[PDB]
Design an enzyme around this catalytic site. Structure first.
Site, PDB file in Angstrom:
ATOM      1  N   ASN A 116     -15.466  16.256 -16.767  1.00  0.00           N
ATOM      2  CA  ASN A 116     -15.512  16.366 -17.927  1.00  0.00           C
ATOM      3  C   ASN A 116     -14.372  17.364 -18.560  1.00  0.00           C
ATOM      4  OD1 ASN A 116     -17.078  19.307 -18.639  1.00  0.00           O
ATOM      5  ND2 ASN A 116     -17.225  18.801 -16.622  1.00  0.00           N
ATOM      6  N   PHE A 120     -15.849  23.288 -24.423  1.00  0.00           N
ATOM      7  CA  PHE A 120     -16.876  24.171 -25.146  1.00  0.00           C
ATOM      8  C   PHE A 120     -16.974  23.478 -26.583  1.00  0.00           C
ATOM      9  CE2 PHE A 120     -17.311  26.866 -22.101  1.00  0.00           C
ATOM     10  CZ  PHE A 120     -16.424  28.071 -21.821  1.00  0.00           C
ATOM     11  N   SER A 186     -14.888  27.822 -16.796  1.00  0.00           N
ATOM     12  CA  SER A 186     -14.543  26.577 -17.222  1.00  0.00           C
ATOM     13  C   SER A 186     -12.992  26.323 -16.905  1.00  0.00           C
ATOM     14  CB  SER A 186     -14.863  26.464 -18.664  1.00  0.00           C
ATOM     15  OG  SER A 186     -13.789  25.626 -19.155  1.00  0.00           O
ATOM     16  N   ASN A 188     -11.603  23.893 -18.724  1.00  0.00           N
ATOM     17  CA  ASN A 188     -11.225  23.183 -19.561  1.00  0.00           C
ATOM     18  C   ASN A 188     -10.679  24.027 -20.774  1.00  0.00           C
ATOM     19  OD1 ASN A 188     -11.797  20.454 -18.380  1.00  0.00           O
ATOM     20  ND2 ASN A 188     -13.927  21.325 -18.795  1.00  0.00           N
ATOM     21  N   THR A 189     -10.720  25.345 -20.878  1.00  0.00           N
ATOM     22  CA  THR A 189     -10.074  26.273 -22.006  1.00  0.00           C
ATOM     23  C   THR A 189      -8.885  27.050 -21.459  1.00  0.00           C
ATOM     24  OG1 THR A 189     -12.397  26.278 -22.651  1.00  0.00           O
ATOM     25  CG2 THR A 189     -11.031  27.132 -24.112  1.00  0.00           C
ATOM     26  N   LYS A 226     -20.433  33.663 -13.935  1.00  0.00           N
ATOM     27  CA  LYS A 226     -20.184  32.166 -13.300  1.00  0.00           C
ATOM     28  C   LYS A 226     -18.897  31.759 -12.872  1.00  0.00           C
ATOM     29  CE  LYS A 226     -21.492  27.394 -13.817  1.00  0.00           C
ATOM     30  NZ  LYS A 226     -21.973  26.376 -14.830  1.00  0.00           N
ATOM     31  N   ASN A 255     -18.729  26.929 -11.211  1.00  0.00           N
ATOM     32  CA  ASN A 255     -18.403  25.820 -12.300  1.00  0.00           C
ATOM     33  C   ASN A 255     -18.102  24.495 -11.406  1.00  0.00           C
ATOM     34  OD1 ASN A 255     -18.235  24.971 -14.921  1.00  0.00           O
ATOM     35  ND2 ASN A 255     -17.757  27.076 -15.271  1.00  0.00           N
TER      36      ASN A 255
HETATM   37  C1  LIG Z   1     -20.834  17.386 -18.695  1.00  0.00           C
HETATM   38  C2  LIG Z   1     -20.555  18.625 -17.829  1.00  0.00           C
HETATM   39  C3  LIG Z   1     -20.669  19.761 -18.915  1.00  0.00           C
HETATM   40  C4  LIG Z   1     -20.710  20.920 -18.297  1.00  0.00           C
HETATM   41  N1  LIG Z   1     -20.561  21.842 -19.215  1.00  0.00           N
HETATM   42  C5  LIG Z   1     -20.741  23.361 -18.843  1.00  0.00           C
HETATM   43  C6  LIG Z   1     -20.716  24.380 -19.579  1.00  0.00           C
HETATM   44  O1  LIG Z   1     -20.967  24.407 -21.012  1.00  0.00           O
HETATM   45  N2  LIG Z   1     -20.776  25.742 -19.259  1.00  0.00           N
HETATM   46  C7  LIG Z   1     -20.992  26.128 -17.996  1.00  0.00           C
HETATM   47  O2  LIG Z   1     -21.065  27.098 -17.443  1.00  0.00           O
HETATM   48  N3  LIG Z   1     -20.919  24.890 -17.013  1.00  0.00           N
HETATM   49  C8  LIG Z   1     -21.015  23.871 -17.566  1.00  0.00           C
HETATM   50  N4  LIG Z   1     -20.956  22.369 -16.480  1.00  0.00           N
HETATM   51  C9  LIG Z   1     -20.964  22.770 -15.044  1.00  0.00           C
HETATM   52  C10 LIG Z   1     -22.343  22.911 -14.574  1.00  0.00           C
HETATM   53  O3  LIG Z   1     -22.942  23.987 -15.192  1.00  0.00           O
HETATM   54  C11 LIG Z   1     -22.279  22.947 -13.072  1.00  0.00           C
HETATM   55  O4  LIG Z   1     -21.643  24.180 -12.755  1.00  0.00           O
HETATM   56  C12 LIG Z   1     -21.449  21.906 -12.324  1.00  0.00           C
HETATM   57  O5  LIG Z   1     -21.572  20.527 -12.622  1.00  0.00           O
HETATM   58  C13 LIG Z   1     -22.135  21.805 -10.837  1.00  0.00           C
HETATM   59  O6  LIG Z   1     -23.330  21.349 -10.746  1.00  0.00           O
HETATM   60  P1  LIG Z   1     -23.701  19.744 -10.712  1.00  0.00           P
HETATM   61  O7  LIG Z   1     -22.852  18.828  -9.747  1.00  0.00           O
HETATM   62  O8  LIG Z   1     -25.150  19.512 -10.313  1.00  0.00           O
HETATM   63  O9  LIG Z   1     -23.574  19.151 -11.993  1.00  0.00           O
HETATM   64  C14 LIG Z   1     -20.826  21.180 -17.017  1.00  0.00           C
HETATM   65  C15 LIG Z   1     -20.846  20.236 -16.191  1.00  0.00           C
HETATM   66  C16 LIG Z   1     -20.831  18.875 -16.562  1.00  0.00           C
HETATM   67  C17 LIG Z   1     -21.287  17.775 -15.678  1.00  0.00           C
HETATM   68  O1  LIG Z   2     -17.524  22.306 -21.761  1.00  0.00           O
HETATM   69  C1  LIG Z   2     -16.765  22.358 -21.135  1.00  0.00           C
HETATM   70  O2  LIG Z   2     -15.483  21.753 -21.204  1.00  0.00           O
HETATM   71  C2  LIG Z   2     -17.012  22.730 -19.518  1.00  0.00           C
HETATM   72  C3  LIG Z   2     -17.409  24.355 -19.403  1.00  0.00           C
HETATM   73  C4  LIG Z   2     -17.760  24.437 -18.466  1.00  0.00           C
HETATM   74  O3  LIG Z   2     -17.768  25.671 -18.164  1.00  0.00           O
HETATM   75  N1  LIG Z   2     -17.777  23.668 -17.296  1.00  0.00           N
HETATM   76  C5  LIG Z   2     -17.180  22.502 -17.569  1.00  0.00           C
HETATM   77  O4  LIG Z   2     -17.356  21.682 -16.266  1.00  0.00           O
HETATM   78  N2  LIG Z   2     -17.052  22.082 -18.634  1.00  0.00           N
END
Ligand SMILES: Cc1cc2nc3c(=O)[nH]c(=O)nc-3n(C[C@H](O)[C@H](O)[C@H](O)COP(=O)(O)O)c2cc1C
Ligand SMILES: O=C(O)c1cc(=O)[nH]c(=O)[nH]1
Length: 367
Positions: A116, A120, A186, A188-189, A226, A255
């Site tokens: 992804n 944000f 993150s 992506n920023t 995080k 993350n």
């Molecule tokens: C679509 C997507 C969006 C995410 N957005 C955020 C985010 O806004 N902030 C954050 O701290 N982590 C975000 N994450 C990361 C998850 O919080 C997590 O750290 C990561 O996916 C590992 O767990 P998982 O494999 O079970 O998803 C995002 C992950 C994905 C899948």
């Molecule tokens: O919103 C996102 O682009 C994003 C934020 C984040 O903390 N981690 C992530 O995988 N995506």
């Protein structure tokens, strides 16, 4: 769809949601369906074995819905109804912003992974504030029942001052939260991850801590960082050191990852963005391990990254996580997976002579 069977959602319904909708619309429908509470009320009762007291709170089970699913706190209550032991709401930025241009989410069904680059997308502090305020006392009752709420802060794309953005989050949302998350991991920023640097992270978290301290007792949440899975060892050392110094209350471990493990079969493996799901797991676990060791078991860790089974779960705990969160696993196996993890986590604890999750935290560092 009414009974809540794993094996149905896995092979049939969930590959069809996928086969019919692009990953983003699917997420949005999921958020809708979840906020409306359309989901089955989970079959599985949480045994006492899964109870964890950590961060000034009891957690009824240690399986959390991770930041990202519920970016703007629209679906908190349904998430609990889904069987999570605690809910975290997705990175909120001070002002609203829209995120990167679509398309920005991709499935790698062969890897059970996702990439992804949302960057944000947020409704921002005001909107989420009113949202959380409107169930503030429900939440108070829930926390006391062992269902705490976490809020995960990020920063605006344009923001000139990083430390000030997070400051705003603490101020606006800190009072509504059992723990707050300084998300500096993150992918992506532009430039965000370089806040993981020692000097830059100490100055940022001094200010966060300070703000937090100025909040009244009852509305004074725990503060965690995080961090990314892609950190050098110097980086981890430092994060670790700063953490102990300033007395940060915890870490959320990992993350998504900008690495791309040898082996990804996904047609979309070479997309820019954070990689999540299975290919992250062991990377993620290993980071729990380095961090638990570096902080000497005195700093609570929420493990996240590729968790989709009890074993996945129990592994990170034995690594040293006190709590685990999953997210991607949800896009493949659906709601049932929450049931699964909890029940497989339970079985395994018994099978390996543990009394409860509490005994198994860090278990590996003592064997
Ligand atoms: C679509 C997507 C969006 C995410 N957005 C955020 C985010 O806004 N902030 C954050 O701290 N982590 C975000 N994450 C990361 C998850 O919080 C997590 O750290 C990561 O996916 C590992 O767990 P998982 O494999 O079970 O998803 C995002 C992950 C994905 C899948
Ligand atoms: O919103 C996102 O682009 C994003 C934020 C984040 O903390 N981690 C992530 O995988 N995506």
């Amino acid at each position: 769809m009414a009974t809540g069977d794993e094996r149905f959602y896995a092979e049939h319904l969930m590959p069809t949601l996928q086969g019919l909708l692009d990953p983003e619309s699917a997420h949005r429908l999921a958020v809708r369906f979840t906020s409306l509470g359309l989901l089955p009320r989970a079959r599985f009762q949480d045994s006492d074995m899964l109870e964890v007291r950590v961060l000034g709170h009891k957690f009824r089970n240690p399986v959390g819905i991770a930041a990202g699913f519920d970016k703007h706190g629209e679906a908190v209550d349904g998430l609990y109804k889904m069987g999570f032991g605690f809910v975290e709401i997705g990175s909120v930025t001070p002002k609203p912003q829209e995120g990167n241009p679509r398309p920005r989410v991709f499935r790698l069904p062969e890897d059970q992974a996702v990439i992804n680059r949302y960057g944000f997308n947020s409704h921002g502090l005001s909107v989420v504030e009113h949202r959380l305020r409107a169930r503030q006392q429900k939440q108070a009752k829930l926390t006391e029942d062992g269902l705490p709420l976490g809020v995960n802060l990020g920063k605006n794309k344009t923001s000139v001052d990083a430390a000030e953005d997070y400051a705003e989050g603490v101020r606006v949302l800190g009072p509504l939260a059992d723990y707050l998350v300084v998300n500096v991991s993150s992918p992506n920023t532009a430039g965000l991850r370089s806040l993981q640097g020692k000097a830059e992270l100490r100055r940022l978290l001094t200010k966060v801590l300070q703000e937090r301290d100025g909040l009244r007792r009852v509305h004074r949440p725990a503060v965690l960082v995080k961090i990314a899975p892609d950190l050098t060892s110097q980086d981890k050392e430092d994060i670790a050191s700063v953490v102990k110094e300033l007395g940060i209350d915890g870490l959320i471990v990992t993350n998504t990852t900008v690495s791309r493990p040898a082996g990804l079969q996904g047609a979309l493996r070479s997309e820019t963005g954070g990689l999540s799901g299975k290919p992250l797991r062991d990377l993620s676990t290993q980071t729990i391990r380095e961090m638990y060791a570096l902080t000497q078991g005195r700093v609570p860790i929420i493990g996240v990254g590729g968790v989709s089974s009890g074993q996945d779960a129990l592994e990170k705990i034995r690594a040293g996580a006190s709590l685990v969160q999953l997210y991607t696993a949800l896009t493949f196996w659906g709601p049932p997976v929450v049931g699964k993890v909890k029940r497989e986590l339970e079985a395994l604890l018994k099978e390996q002579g543990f009394g409860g999750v509490t005994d198994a935290i860090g278990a590996d560092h003592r064997r």
